[model samples]
Target: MTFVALYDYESRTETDLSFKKGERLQIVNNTEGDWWLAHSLTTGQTGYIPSNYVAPSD
Candidate 1:
């Protein structure tokens, strides 16, 4: 699944996700919460990103 980034986040810790503006991510997990498991198609990185940082693709 694909989603839009609502905020720019940099991985400050090992558990955080790093992303920039105008980037879409491939969601590896279907679950929802304060954070979700996601796969970054741009960098091929995987981690937990804040749920608020992602929006459902139109």
Candidate 2:
């Protein structure tokens, strides 16, 4: 599924994914604690992002 970033986030660790507010991301996995694996369509990068920072795109 796709999600839209609700806030700007900069990765604090190598495992984290950074994104800007209003950016679109594709969720790859959501069962990993408070962080979900996502693919950033804008950057073409993939990593874990805060689940609360994003909302369902559709």
Candidate 3:
């Protein structure tokens, strides 16, 4: 699974993969529009988020 960068702000350096409270990340190439995220801080896997929803962090 490939983790993607969901920038909350357009002026952020280095995209964020690990999410914080209210922060969000998206799994790359998700055709379905749904809430998804990458599994960070663990060895789980990557995930996706709905295209309509932007991440909470930059």
Candidate 4:
């Protein structure tokens, strides 16, 4: 269950501005830590984000 993250780099953290919603990303792998990673299916950039900060869209 992976979803695209809404990011706002303008704020203190990357999870501030709500850069995107309804948009989607690709989950490459997951860990038991506080973060998860997704490959940008649209951009192919590997990114790390909070695991609890996303919701399913598709």
Candidate 5:
């Protein structure tokens, strides 16, 4: 699945993924609660991102 960042999220830990607002991301895993594993299309980085910070692209 795909999503777009609704706001800039700065990673506070190594496990988190930092992303800028409006950035496109690919959902790698969504089983985790609150956080989802995503691949950043802008940076090609994968890490856990807050589910609420992004919305479905389509």
Candidate 6:
């Protein structure tokens, strides 16, 4: 599945996957906590993003 970042999420702690608003990402997994595993479409990187930070694309 695909999703778009709803707000700019700056990873202040780690270099996980700092993304900006409107960034497209792939929903990798969501069987965990408030953080969902996602893959960046632009950077070709993957990390866990706050579930509330993104919305389903389309």
Q: What lDDT tens digits, residue by residue, belong to model 6 across residues 1-58?
A: 6899999988755645778999999988889888878899988988888889999896
- Whichever of 1 and 4 has more lDDT, that candidate is 1
Residue runs of model 6 more than 4 Å from their true location after superposition: none
Question: Considering only N, C-alpha and C atoms within 3 Å, which residue pairs clash in candidate 6?
Answer: none
- Cα-lDDT of candidate 3: 0.39
Candidate number achieving the greatest lDDT relative to the actual structure: 5
lDDT of 4 by residue, 1-58 (tens): 5576564322235532222444466666676476666655555556665656566656
Instruction: Select the stronger candidate by lDDT from 1 and 5.
Output: 5
Q: In candidate 1, which residue ranges exceed 4 Å CA deviation?
A: 30-32
lDDT of candidate model 2 versus the reference: 0.93
TM-score order, best first, reads 5, 2, 6, 1, 4, 3
Ordered from best to worst lDDT, the candidate numbers read: 5, 2, 6, 1, 4, 3
Q: Residue 3 error for model 2, in Å?
A: 0.4
Question: Candidate 2: which stretches are off by over 4 Å?
Answer: none
Question: Tens digit of lDDT per residue, candidate 3, span 1-58?
Answer: 3333344322222332334334434354544445443444333434443444353343
Model 3: residue 5 alpha-carbon error in angstroms: 12
The CA lDDT of each predicted structure is 0.80, 0.93, 0.39, 0.54, 0.94, 0.86
Q: What is the C-alpha lDDT profile of model 1 across 18-52, one tens digit per residue?
A: 88765788887757667888888888889888878
- Tens digits of lDDT, candidate 2, 1-58: 6899999999999988999999999999988699899999999999999899999997
The digit string of per-residue lDDT tens for model 5 on 1-58 reads 5899999999989989999999999999998688999999999999999999999996
User: For model 5, what is the alpha-carbon lDDT of residue 29?
Assistant: 92
User: Which pairs of residues collide in candidate 3?
Assistant: 27-47, 27-48, 36-48
The TM-score measured for candidate 6 stands at 0.86
